[PDB]
Amino acid sequence: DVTVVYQNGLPVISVRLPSRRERCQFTLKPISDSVGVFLRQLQEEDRGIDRVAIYSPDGVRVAASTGIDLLLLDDFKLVINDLTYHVRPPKR
């Protein structure tokens, strides 16, 4: 359900937000954006989000200050309220 696709060289993360049926896509800058930036953009898009967090595939919380480029080196878990998505970005 959450996909990562590069378009024009930048990662586009498409997510299903809880308040809406229509997917929402987030383009990020891997060199400047952080995990915390992405999670804040999610919260700004949907007031129905009470909790967002990103974890490693082993289940360890990823620091907010971590660069998006580092996040997208491997799979990760994105928690939105009570749903956990396994995100599998393409290797770069």
Author numbering: 74 to 165
From the paper:
The mitochondrial Ca2+ uniporter complex (mtCU) formed across the IMM is the predominant channel responsible for mediating Ca2+ uptake into the matrix. The principal components of mtCU are the pore-forming, mitochondrial Ca2+ uniporter (MCU) subunits that oligomerize into tetrameric channels. The conserved Asp-Ile-Met-Glu (DIME) motif in each subunit forms the Ca2+ selectivity filter at the intermembrane space (IMS)-exposed channel entrance by symmetric arrangement of the four subunits. Indeed, we and others demonstrated that binding of Ca2+ or Mg2+ to an MCU regulating acidic patch (MRAP) on the NTD destabilizes domain self-association and inhibits mtCU activity.
Here, we re-crystallized the human MCU-NTD in the absence of divalent cations, determining a structure to 1.6 Å resolution; moreover, this structure is the highest-resolution WT MCU-NTD structure we have achieved to date in the absence of divalent cations, providing the best starting point to investigate the effects of Ca2+ and Mg2+ binding on conformation and dynamics using in silico simulations. Given the high sequence similarity to MCUb-NTD and since no high-resolution structure exists for MCUb, this new structure is also the best template to homology model MCUb-NTD. Similar to our previous crystal structures, the present WT MCU-NTD shows a β-grasp-like fold, consisting of two helices, held between two β-sheets. The C-terminus (i.e. residues 166–189) is not resolved, suggesting the region is dynamic under our crystallization conditions. The central α1-helix (residues 108–118) is approximately perpendicular to the second capping α2-helix (residues 141–146). The antiparallel β1, β2 and β3 strands of the first β-sheet are made up of residues 76–80, 83–88 and 97–100, respectively, while the antiparallel β4, β5 and β6 strands consist of residues 125–128, 149–153 and 156–160, respectively. Notably, the residues that make up MRAP in human MCU-NTD (i.e. D131, D147, D148) are not fully conserved in human MCUb-NTD at the primary (i.e. D116, N132, D133) and three-dimensional (3D) structural levels. Over the 1 μs simulation time, this single Ca2+ ion underwent 95,239 total interactions with MCU-NTDWT, with ∼97 % contacts occurring with MRAP residues D131, D147 and D148 (i.e. 29,851, 29,594 and 32,478 interactions, respectively). Collectively, these MCU-NTDWT MD data suggest that single Ca2+ binding occurs preferentially in MRAP, increasing L5 rigidity, while additional Ca2+ ions interact with the central helix, destabilizing the structure. Collectively, the data suggest that an ∼10 °C increase in temperature favours MCU-NTD structural stability and decreased dynamics in contrast to MCUb-NTD, which is destabilized by the higher temperature.
